[PDB]
Amino acid sequence: EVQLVESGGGLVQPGGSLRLSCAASGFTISSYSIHWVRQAPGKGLEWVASISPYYGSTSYADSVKGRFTISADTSKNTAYLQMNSLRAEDTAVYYCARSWYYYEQNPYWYQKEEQALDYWGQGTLVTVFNQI
Amino acid sequence: DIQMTQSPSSLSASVGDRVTITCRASQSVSSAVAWYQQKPGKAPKLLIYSASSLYSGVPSRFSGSRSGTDFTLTISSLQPEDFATYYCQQSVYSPVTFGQGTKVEIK
Amino acid sequence: CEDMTFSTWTPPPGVHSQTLSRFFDKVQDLGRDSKTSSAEVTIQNVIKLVDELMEAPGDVEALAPPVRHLIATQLLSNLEDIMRILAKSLPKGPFTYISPSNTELTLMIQERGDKNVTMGQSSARMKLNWAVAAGGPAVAGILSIQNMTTLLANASLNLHSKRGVQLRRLSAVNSIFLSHNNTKELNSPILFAFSHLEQELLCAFWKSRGGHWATEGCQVLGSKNGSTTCQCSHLASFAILMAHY
């Protein structure tokens, strides 16, 4: 079946670097977009980045465009997220989803660029600690 | 960016009661607004996409509609496993924006 | 509103069946218990009563095909009228209900305006501009009856444009209505997306033999994944049919 398993999260100091990995199984990432969605502890869902491996089509958020780098390797069928210069505002649970362009379902009813995250990951926790 | 405003951000209902959540949006997203449900400690699950289409496997008691920039999610009859937090999302214009979240609690 | 809401549900002169009569006595008692319970409960009871009549017909299946078609036409008209009257006294906003027999009803009661509106359920969805429902708050409803075989059997399809036809309904009988009664000259076209379907596929409605399937100007945009999208310029009881010649 379709599974997304994240990894690479953990404790980190502000100003450090941490790379997240999201392995995708049950499908080929070359036909969907792999969004990265974070959720601060006790807060709402927030977008972080996005990737379309067949097009490249790198896209990032506002408080993220400067440092995070999102990559997708078709050989391993996984998508990464090379977070850097981390701050205490980046402590959250990062999910990787699978954006689904459902235009081909009803091309006479939907628009070309409509998409929805149909299969989510499980969420890896990133902690940015200035002291322990 | 499009600010997705949601109401009432906290709802107390019971089993069988009809529950409606509103997600009025700034600017104008035509119909591409999707609804997710997140039980505590779990990843969200897509419920409705394009503001009216039910995703595969979702119970038929969930319905959605659009009235301009106002998008509503309605539950025909609430059930004990329907108490969770609901978000609305747009992907038309970057950045994609989520709703503040409406939490449904038992009475 | 004038306590004569249920007086129209009468069996037409000439017919004589012991199931239609009992169904109409049931709707009469429903009208009796309509000023007491709720507008949200009488509507569900009407839907359940229609489901009971459709699921287990008695000598209705022994009626002549013209009489059955006339019964179906009157039933759809009365259902539209009752739904309009009941929705006129509902809180503003969408109202959705799904009967145990999967009879799906959705409503949209809201103020007058020209805002694009998308509404519907699994069996039928609608993409209309609200400037056509206003014609008090406007109403827009979709009533999809899945099983309608006994009343709609041995019906004929007339295309009016242009020998043998082998009809086979592929979707539920989705009856569409708004507040304004003149529902055949809508200014802006409506977009429909019916489901359950899937040598031709047509979007046809029930036109008052006492009733026959008619196309009469409803462009079929296309069909895919067991769902046909039709663009229509009027409102009636639409249902996708296969027209094997």
* CATH of residue C226: 2.60.220.50
CB-based contact C116:C129 (threshold 8 Å): yes
**Domain coverage including residue A16:** 3-128
Query: Does some domain include residue C31?
Result: yes
Give SS3 for C25.
Answer: helix
Q: Residue B59: what are its φ and ψ, rounded to 5°?
A: -60, 150
Q: Is residue B87 less than 8 Å (CB to CB) from chain A?
A: yes
- The residue in chain B having the minimum alpha-carbon distance to the alpha carbon of residue C105 is B76
B10-106 falls under which CATH superfamily? Immunoglobulins (2.60.40.10)
Q: Is residue C49 less than 8 Å (CB to CB) from chain A?
A: no
Which distant-in-sequence residues (6+ apart) come within 8 Å of C209 by Cβ? C65, C66, C69, C156
d(CA C106, CA A96): 35
Which distant-in-sequence residues (6+ apart) come within 8 Å of B24 by Cβ? B5, B6, B7, B69, B70, B71
d(CA C5, CA C134): 22
Which pair of tokens denotes residue A88? 């205490």
d(CA A58, CA B29): 22
d(CA A75, CA A96): 18
Kindly state the helix (H) or strand (E) to which residue C149 belongs, with its residue range. helix C149-152
Task: Please report, for chain B, the start and end positions of each structural domain, with discontinuous segments joined by +.
Answer: 10-106
Of A44, A118, A121, the CB nearest to B46: A118
CB-based contact A10:A94 (threshold 8 Å): no
Size of the A and C interface in Cβ pairs below 8 Å = 18
Which pair of tokens denotes residue A42? 């006790």
Give the minimum alpha-carbon distance from B76 to chain A in angstroms, rounded to a whole number: 23
Which pair of tokens denotes residue B32? 């591409």
Which amino acid appears at position C242 of this protein? Answer: M
DSSP B34-45: EEEEE-TTS--E
Q: Would the CB atoms of A117 and B30 count as touching at under 8 Å?
A: no
d(CA C240, CA C245): 16
Provide Rg for chain C, Cα atoms.
18
Residues in chain A closer than 8 A to C227 (CB atoms): 106
Residues in chain A closer than 8 A to C224 (CB atoms): 105-108
Q: Where are the beta strands (DSSP E) in A26-103?
A: 36-39, 45-52, 56-60, 72-73, 78-83, 92-96, 98-100
Q: What is the CATH number of the domain that holds A107?
A: 2.60.40.10
Q: Where are the beta strands (DSSP E) in chain A?
A: 3-7, 11-12, 18-25, 36-39, 45-52, 56-60, 72-73, 78-83, 92-96, 98-100, 116-119, 124-128
CB-based contact B47:B35 (threshold 8 Å): yes
Resolution of this deposited model, Å: 3.2
d(CA B79, CA C196): 26
CB-based contact B9:B97 (threshold 8 Å): no
Which pair of tokens denotes residue C201? 């596929």
Q: Residue C61: what are its φ and ψ, rounded to 5°?
A: -65, -15
Domain count, chain C: 1
Q: What angle do CA C82, C84, C87 make, to 5 degrees?
A: 105
Q: What angle do CA C84, C90, C93 make, to 5 degrees?
A: 100
CB-based contact A121:A97 (threshold 8 Å): yes
CA dihedral A22, A25, A30, A32 (to 10 degrees): -80
Domain count, chain A: 1
Residues in chain B closer than 8 A to C134 (CB atoms): none
Q: Which of B47, B57, B69, B67 is nearest to B2 (CA)?
A: B69
Q: Is residue C9 less than 8 Å (CB to CB) from chain B?
A: no
Give the minimum alpha-carbon distance from A102 to chain C in angstroms, rounded to a whole number: 12
Which pair of tokens denotes residue C136? 């008090």
Q: Which of C57, C62, C180, C202 is nearest to C128 (CA)?
A: C180
Size of the A and B interface in Cβ pairs below 8 Å = 67
Which distant-in-sequence residues (6+ apart) come within 8 Å of B42 by Cβ? none
Q: Give the 3-state secondary structure percentages of chain A, helix then strand then coil, rounded to 5.
A: 5, 45, 50
CA dihedral C93, C118, B104, B28 (to 10 degrees): -100
User: C-alpha B104: how far from its chain's center?
Assistant: 11
Query: Does some domain include residue C146?
Result: yes
Q: Where are the beta strands (DSSP E) in chain B?
A: 10-13, 19-22, 33-38, 45-49, 53-54, 62-67, 71-75, 85-90, 97-98, 102-106
Provide Rg for chain A, Cα atoms.
15
